[model samples]
Target: MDKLRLKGVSYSLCTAAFTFTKIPAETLHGTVTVEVQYAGTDGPCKVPAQMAVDMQTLTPVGRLITANPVITESTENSKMMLELDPPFGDSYIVIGVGEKKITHHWHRSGSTIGK
Candidate 1:
């Protein structure tokens, strides 16, 4: 099976998973930006979101405000674009690419790392 491996970790494109190491907020600069693209029955669409820092823990607070992807395909490979406001501290982003569309579910772990 095709897989994406990073730092000895592997993720199958079909059923993939990812893990990122701790990046200190102090080490980051300005706001972080992300772009997500997925397939729609008509064509392609995109999503944009930002992550803000929790002042108390200095950790990223995840939240996404999404909008419907407009149907404006210039070509079979064309993609739509959306803009979003930047977040505080540093931001982390996730993007999925494929023939099928995927939805994201967000939740906080029982315990956070910053604390």
Candidate 2:
């Protein structure tokens, strides 16, 4: 239901993370999303917003779920929390074909880390 593109991984990287410049899709239903983008010469994509939530808010490599329901899609010109799940070693790829990209930030009002 959207068209998320890249801004050339070579130069569009923001704070070690990918900054989606404009979102074409306008609807989401969860907090945990998946990220898959291409790289020209990257060490590892990193960001602070959600990247710091290594305790629980982060989804390693699995299906995404919501910590909440419904989403107020980004303004298409702001920073978003992208979740990437790829194994270490040799790597190189391109845009994702489907599924979630930004995980609804679980900053809390808080959670039990529990479902």
Candidate 3:
């Protein structure tokens, strides 16, 4: 539960359920990036939600990066996902829902975050 949280990214209601991960991109370089998947049409989260990425460090260097986590709706279960080009290291990925926030600790080896 000790994961970094994303700013700007949020839902329209009192949502407390979702998934976040940093996986290998399906590109040539196969560079790593983060993605969030959540239920769109039901429960806590509803449409017109906001999703973005943020990074934090222990030093003076600070930043608030946004990738515009797009909405990719399909089937009865609306879904969405997007990847980030990533930035200078010493950070973690995140997602926000309503007033609550979700954070994820990452491991460079797995890209899926954590040991």
Candidate 4:
């Protein structure tokens, strides 16, 4: 299977994480490698963009899975290779970056994440 285009990344000030959505094709099973390119040059905030997956919930809602995936960028643009867990019919790609607190976020397609 090629891939499915789900949704863009969503944000939560409560958890301080971004969430994206995806769907897997029947032909492809297991984990999908999501490659993401993101950049946010906002302000003194120094919101360097980031990418992640397998996110659960935050301090309040879900489990809150930390993004420890993997990334390889070839240029100034942030490039990341992430793996989602359980392989969802639809999942989220979360991103967060910056020197520390101020961060930029986004997600890749689970159509290419995990199984």
Highest lDDT: give the candidate number. 3
For residues 3-99, write the lDDT of model 1, one tens digit per residue. Answer: 4343563444333222222222221342222333323342342232233333234233433334665536655333444433443323433344344
**Model 4: lDDT to the true structure:** 0.35
Instruction: Estimate every model's Cα lDDT from 0 to 1.
Output: 0.35, 0.31, 0.42, 0.35
Q: Please, what are the lDDT tens digits per residue for candidate 4 over residues 3-114?
A: 5554676664322333232332223544444433434332112222322343344211112133553333334445444443332343443345332332223333547545
Per-model TM values vs. the true structure: 0.32, 0.20, 0.40, 0.29
Worst 10 residues of 1 by lDDT: 18-27
Superposed Cα RMSD, model 2: 14.9
Q: Among all windows of ten consecutive residues in candidate 2, which has the lowest summed lDDT?
A: 88-97
Clash pairs, candidate 4, are 20-92, 30-115, 31-114, 31-115, 32-112, 32-113, 57-63, 57-64, 86-115, 87-115
- Please give, for residues 83-109, the per-residue lDDT of candidate 2 as tens digits: 333322212222322233343332333
Question: Candidate 2 — number of clashing residue pairs?
Answer: 0
lDDT: the better of candidates 1 and 2 = 1
Score candidate 1 by TM-score against the native: 0.32
Count the clashes in each prediction. 0, 0, 7, 10
Give me the runs in candidate 2 sitting further than 4 Å from their true place: 1-71, 96-115
Please estimate how well model 3 matches the true structure, expressed as its whole-model Cα lDDT.
Answer: 0.42
Q: In model 3, what is the error at residue 68, expressed in angstroms? A: 4.2
lDDT of candidate 1 at residue 88, scale 0 to 100 = 31
